[PDB]
Write a protein that binds this ligand. Structure first.
Ligand code: MAU
Ligand code: GDP
Ligand code: MG
Length: 391
């Protein structure tokens, strides 16, 4: 099976409170579009609620969609998943309204930079009262505004992921205009096509892909998955595996796939599987980056400009201090780092911007201008930018 690039590629996903319908909507999206484009493989709700990374396309674009379980123990996974989204679909149940996770996922989306949000008010089959429905929309729009998303401008589609999914199960060929529920899914697909702009991909820069996960394709070798950040990659390309391990490893690409389909060449923006030559799953891991040889190097000590979040922004009320060892989030991983403030400075208070030094306990592919977040456990306390590599 081969994958032929024909429409602009976009990465999206589902966020929202537990049980509001993220997984059901993900399944509905694949079934609904499958009726038009045969290249769209059907994905049962049972399987997704286990892969959780599916594909589907509209007349305008090809989409890679990650369905976030959204639980607290999956926080680190949501971070990397949301970080690679061009836009997110916020699912809110019409029968419950916004709940704690609706708010939590919105803040995380903001902190990792999700550029746009499209809302899908789910389970409307459970609520008919026009007033209650308008109240829920009002609440969601206000919630979004609260975290600085353009709440008054986002699309808010009302529908039922379950009824749409069941219709497709009954008639997999159901097409647009034939079923009111299925049509609500098309309203969402249209909103996604229109509201979420297709970003400019940095395809002309040196290849770089942060590793999300590593698997062994039984009888084929190890494969590293991730979203290409910049550049391109194809079979026969030499690539370096940088960071985390003791030394940088160099190998050759033996395969490139898009949703398990042979891909001519992967480009920035594509979430692919890169099969590597002679490397075991013990030589490549999440957090490392695949890159054009010599384009990026591993480091542990650097200087950075850092903004300490205010308590009013979810951070702490106490500041940073020398010897502090929080977690530093770089691309797809997080590593402990020791903070060292300049002479004379005993503390950097919330709300202040300062430049200090850091020494990670493990090497990481670093470069000037690279952004990173600082978290202490499950709380974001700082936002920084690498300003100088020391070693
Ligand atoms: C966020 C986790 C990892 C991020 C890692 C890296 O982040 C980056 O470095 C990123 C770059 C900026 C980063 O460093 N993010 C790191 C940080 C970035 C932070 C900014 C931008 C901000 O400005 C100060 C804006 C959100 C700003 O804040 C406001 C937020 C107020 C929140 C109040 C919540 C309070 C009282 C609260 O009790 C509360 C709640 O209500 C819900 C949930 N919980 C848990 C809470 O406790 C408003 O929303 C504004 O918009 C890049 O994205 C990297 O590529 C990435 C993704 C690798
Ligand atoms: N009545 C109704 N139930 C729904 C709808 N969408 C999802 N559900 C159900 O609500 C439950 C949670 O759905 P799921 O997609 O797993 O929620 P998630 O935690 O956000 O992923 C399941 O039992 C689904 O069948 C809907 O539109 N209407
Ligand atoms: Mg789910």
């Amino acid at each position: 099976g081969e994958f032929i690039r024909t429409k602009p590629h976009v990465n999206v996903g589902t966020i929202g409170h537990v049980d509001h319908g993220k997984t059901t909507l993900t399944a509905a999206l694949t079934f609904v579009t499958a009726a038009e484009n045969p290249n769209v493989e059907v994905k049962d709700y049972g399987d997704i609620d286990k892969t959780a990374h599916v594909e589907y396309e509209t007349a305008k674009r090809h989409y890679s969609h990650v369905d976030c379980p959204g639980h607290a123990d999956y926080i680190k996974n949501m971070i990397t998943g949301a970080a690679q989204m061009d836009g997110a679909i916020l699912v809110v149940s019409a029968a419950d309204g916004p709940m704690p996770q609706t708010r939590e996922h919105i803040l995380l989306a903001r902190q990792v930079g999700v550029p746009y949000i499209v809302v899908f008010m789910n389970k409307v089959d459970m609520v008919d009262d026009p007033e209650l429905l308008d109240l829920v929309e009002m609440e969601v729009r206000d919630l979004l505004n609260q975290y600085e998303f353009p709440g008054d401008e986002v699309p808010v589609i009302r529908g039922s992921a379950l009824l749409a999914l069941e219709q497709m199960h009954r008639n997999p060929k159901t097409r647009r205009g034939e079923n009111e529920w299925v049509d609500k899914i098309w309203e969402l697909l249209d909103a996604i096509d229109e509201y979420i702009p297709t970003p400019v991909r940095d395809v002309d820069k040196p290849f770089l892909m942060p590793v999300e996960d590593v698997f062994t394709i039984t009888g084929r070798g190890t494969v590293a998955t991730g979203r290409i950040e910049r550049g391109k990659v194809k079979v026969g390309d030499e690539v370096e595996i940088v960071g985390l391990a003791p030394e940088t490893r160099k190998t050759v690409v033996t395969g490139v796939e898009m949703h398990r389909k042979t891909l001519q060449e992967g480009i920035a923006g594509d979430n692919v599987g890169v099969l590597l030559r002679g490397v075991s799953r013990e030589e490549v891991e999440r957090g490392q980056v695949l890159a054009k040889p010599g384009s990026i190097t591993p480091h542990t000590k650097f200087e950075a400009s850092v903004y300490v979040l205010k308590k009013e922004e979810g951070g702490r009320h106490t500041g940073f201090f020398s010897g502090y060892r929080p977690q530093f989030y770089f691309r797809t991983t997080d590593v402990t780092g020791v903070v060292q403030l300049p002479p004379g400075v005993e503390m950097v208070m919330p709300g202040d911007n300062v430049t200090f030094t850091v020494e990670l306990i493990k090497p990481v592919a670093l470069e000037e201008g690279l952004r990173f977040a600082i978290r202490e456990g499950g709380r974001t306390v700082g936002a920084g930018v690498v300003t100088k590599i020391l070693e």
